[PDB]
Ligand binder design. Structure first.
Ligand SMILES: Nc1nc2c(ncn2[C@@H]2O[C@H](COP(=O)(O)OP(=O)(O)CP(=O)(O)O)[C@@H](O)[C@H]2O)c(=O)[nH]1
Ligand SMILES: Nc1nc2c(ncn2[C@@H]2O[C@H](COP(=O)(O)OP(=O)(O)CP(=O)(O)O)[C@@H](O)[C@H]2O)c(=O)[nH]1
Lengths: 431, 431
């Protein structure tokens, strides 16, 4: 197809970064449609290692154009840092990037509200940890926030900031007992970068329809994982935004019906961070293995990342929330030199029932125990394999059950952290 | 199709009621996907005439299940009053109605916020905000609110409530100088409707996935008109949620790829309630003519609704934001008896450029001059016309021109409020 959606089907750490850059070679336009500065996509350019969090992945491509859409909450502060980076590293970012007028803006007071929230509410529980993504979203809904649009009219921009800034300053100092935020400084700061942003502004949903009208290849990138979707996920342990394919129409302004293909990235085993339900977690040695063999540690003060078997029951939930077209299985290599592999195919509830559908985020997940289906292992090294002819019988057998169980096939198979380590059985853009 | 979506392509008040009642005779399932107790739909409940604001008119039917999808904010207080209302009338509401667990709850403190917010940020001349819909959405997105699913753990609602309420009385009394909502009252009232609300909860996403797999006729319905969309509408002047079709994946739990036909209801002309750009608004006799014959009175303390000719530039945005499948033209009969008639085909920008796309809320609406096509009208009344042939050549020219300027077929025409006064040219379901 031409409009392809890419995203992780679990809780993150699916290993999205590789496939992305991979699909970014056949796509003309690239669009971020949800969330904020927490994309987490690492790259390398000027012989130095750089990690992007805002700029889409396609900025490297010369004849590609990357767009940040209406669904992304913006932070000039974080855009100027990433640009400055690539510009220094020699990348025409200004001639390659475009943003929506409708993008909600995160300003220092928005980080302050967050910083002051967790500390207070409870510095050990999930408040929200600094970048004010939630406050930016909340101000939006309530119809008091600001957008890139506003920057066009400076006179008006100054007055509105003061109306918003006072309501927030009031609750900061008065409620939270935190130092206030100087309106003049936020003002100085944003004006200094105004004309940059304003100059990258474009009519996105028009350009997108126009792009569809002529058959250009577009790829939509979600930044976080499906099972953390503010609504549909394992609530209350969720993230600030919607993390599913359905947020694409809302996020860019394209119709529901022009979503042609939806690629769901898929790790061969599972991992989660922070508390939250995790039915197939492993407690002792295989658990250790799946971590040691897969690089499951840190990456941002990540004390440690939990691991367990592939839960088919939740993957199925993701299949339905996204109307997934096909999969992209990652890290099958970690499974090598393993006695066997289990696939979870149903749960046992605390009342004694056996159920094939994710329990409502209102029933004890801590109670559900996984009915595992065991399968023979494989000692052969899959790492690096660049065709399926070299995949063992057992490897192909594990695939089929995941396919037979989920009711969606695997079009891309990944066999290593390197580009070359991939098997494109189909490719979203020609399907 | 089979998964049908029905919604307003303009600024609301397009005349959806009649169409929805009509389709619910064909639908096995009816789904609300965005909104609150706005709905507003006069049902002549077998003798007695009643105005439903939350329950779907599809509840009056012997073989249709009605679902309040998770994108709708829920008010117990409100739904109980509608239950007994219909249960008094003899309708088994309690057994054809299913609520999703993800539905945010609207409660006392959300309305009393609304009622204070209006006082201060409003003025004497009908302050119609007091509902609590904006507020609840503000709590959801900030992972700070309660849901229906929360009711499944009585001891935990008790604590999470005191917290979200602690935060709200601080605003009510210290910022707004209004009073506080009493906690034990709100805890008490809610607990007395709990076992009822949790007795109707169901796994929505699966249910729908089942009916689709199974091929049943599922209908989805939007409450507010398209250009009021929190995102792609006239910013200041937009509601609190997402009115377009994309709100379907998100408020129900059914991915984007499974919406089949997206039917947009168009009014023979446009009207507007309140502030905001209306580039074709009429200030002369024709307006009075349109308002008068259309009965565009707000059906209560209805300050006259703004009027004007139909706007193809505005209407085209709608088509683009929802990937419209076909139109349903209403109140065409209101134009009977008009020497000639116009339609807007382009907007003239101040620097002369004539264009076919609305100003991206920024380089303003206020400055736009409209460009029309004046075509002759009709005299011969078209009320009740049941066949394509019985329409005058002037009224037919008109329809075909909307079709041309937009590129979407008018598949359904309404020629009177009763149900027999309708022309089905395509039929969304068997299309
Ligand atoms: N061994 C192995 N490593 C892989 C494979 N595919 C990717 N990797 C590696 O695993 C990691 C995958 O995560 P990354 O590529 O950063 O994407 P992501 O983790 O989904 C993005 P974020 O975590 O910010 O949402 C990378 O460090 C990459 O080199 C694979 O097939 N096998
Ligand atoms: N003369 C005439 N009257 C019509 C026609 N179609 C509907 N009506 C009248 O339209 C009015 C509006 O219908 P209704 O369905 O209640 O409102 P709505 O447009 O669905 C919803 P909202 O106001 O929330 O946007 C009704 O009061 C009905 O009496 C028509 O084709 N001709």
């Amino acid at each position: 197809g031409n409009n392809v959606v890419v995203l992780g089907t679990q809780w993150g750490d699916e290993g999205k970064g590789k496939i992305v850059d991979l699909l970014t070679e056949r796509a003309k336009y690239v669009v971020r449609y949800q969330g904020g500065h927490n994309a987490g996509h690492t790259l390398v350019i000027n012989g130095e290692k750089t990690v992007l969090h805002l700029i889409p992945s396609g900025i490297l491509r010369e004849n590609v154009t990357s767009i940040i859409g209406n669904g992304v909450v913006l932070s000039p502060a974080a855009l100027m840092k990433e640009m400055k980076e690539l510009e220094d590293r020699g990348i025409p970012v200004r001639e390659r990037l475009l943003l929506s007028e409708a993008c909600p803006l995160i300003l220092d007071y928005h980080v302050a509200l967050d910083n002051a929230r967790e500390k207070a509410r409870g510095a050990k529980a999930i408040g929200t940890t600094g970048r004010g993504i939630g406050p930016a979203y909340e101000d939006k809904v309530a119809r008091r926030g600001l957008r890139v649009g506003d920057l066009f009219d400076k006179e008006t921009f100054a007055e509105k900031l003061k109306e918003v800034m006072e309501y927030h300053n009031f609750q900061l100092v008065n409620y939270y007992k935190a130092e206030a935020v100087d309106y003049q400084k936020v003002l100085d700061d944003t004006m200094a970068v105004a004309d940059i942003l304003t100059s990258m502004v474009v009519d996105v949903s028009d350009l997108l329809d126009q792009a569809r009208q002529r058959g250009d290849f577009v790829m939509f990138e979600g930044a976080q994982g499906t099972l953390l979707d503010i609504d549909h996920g394992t609530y209350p342990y969720v993230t600030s935004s919607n993390t599913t394919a359905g947020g694409v129409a809302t996020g860019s302004g394209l119709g529901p019906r022009y979503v042609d293909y939806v690629l769901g990235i898929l790790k061969a085993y599972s991992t989660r961070v922070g508390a939250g339900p995790f039915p197939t977690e492993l407690f002792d040695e295989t658990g250790e293995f799946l971590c040691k063999q897969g690089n499951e540690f840190g990456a941002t003060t990540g004390r440690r990342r939990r691991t367990g078997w592939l839960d088919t029951v939740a993957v199925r939930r993701a299949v339905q929330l996204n109307s997934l077209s096909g999969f992209c299985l990652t890290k099958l290599d970690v499974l090598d030199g393993l006695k066997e592999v289990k696939l979870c195919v149903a749960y046992r509830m605390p009342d004694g029932r056996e159920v094939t559908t994710t329990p409502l985020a209102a029933d004890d997940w801590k109670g559900v125990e996984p009915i595992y289906e065991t399968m023979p292992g494989w000692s052969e090294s899959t790492f690096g394999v660049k065709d399926r002819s070299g995949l063992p019988q057992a490897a192909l057998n594990y695939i089929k059950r995941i396919e037979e169980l989920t009711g969606v096939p695997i079009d891309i198979i990944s066999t290593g952290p390197d580009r070359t380590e991939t098997m494109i059985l189909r490719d979203p853009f020609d399907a």
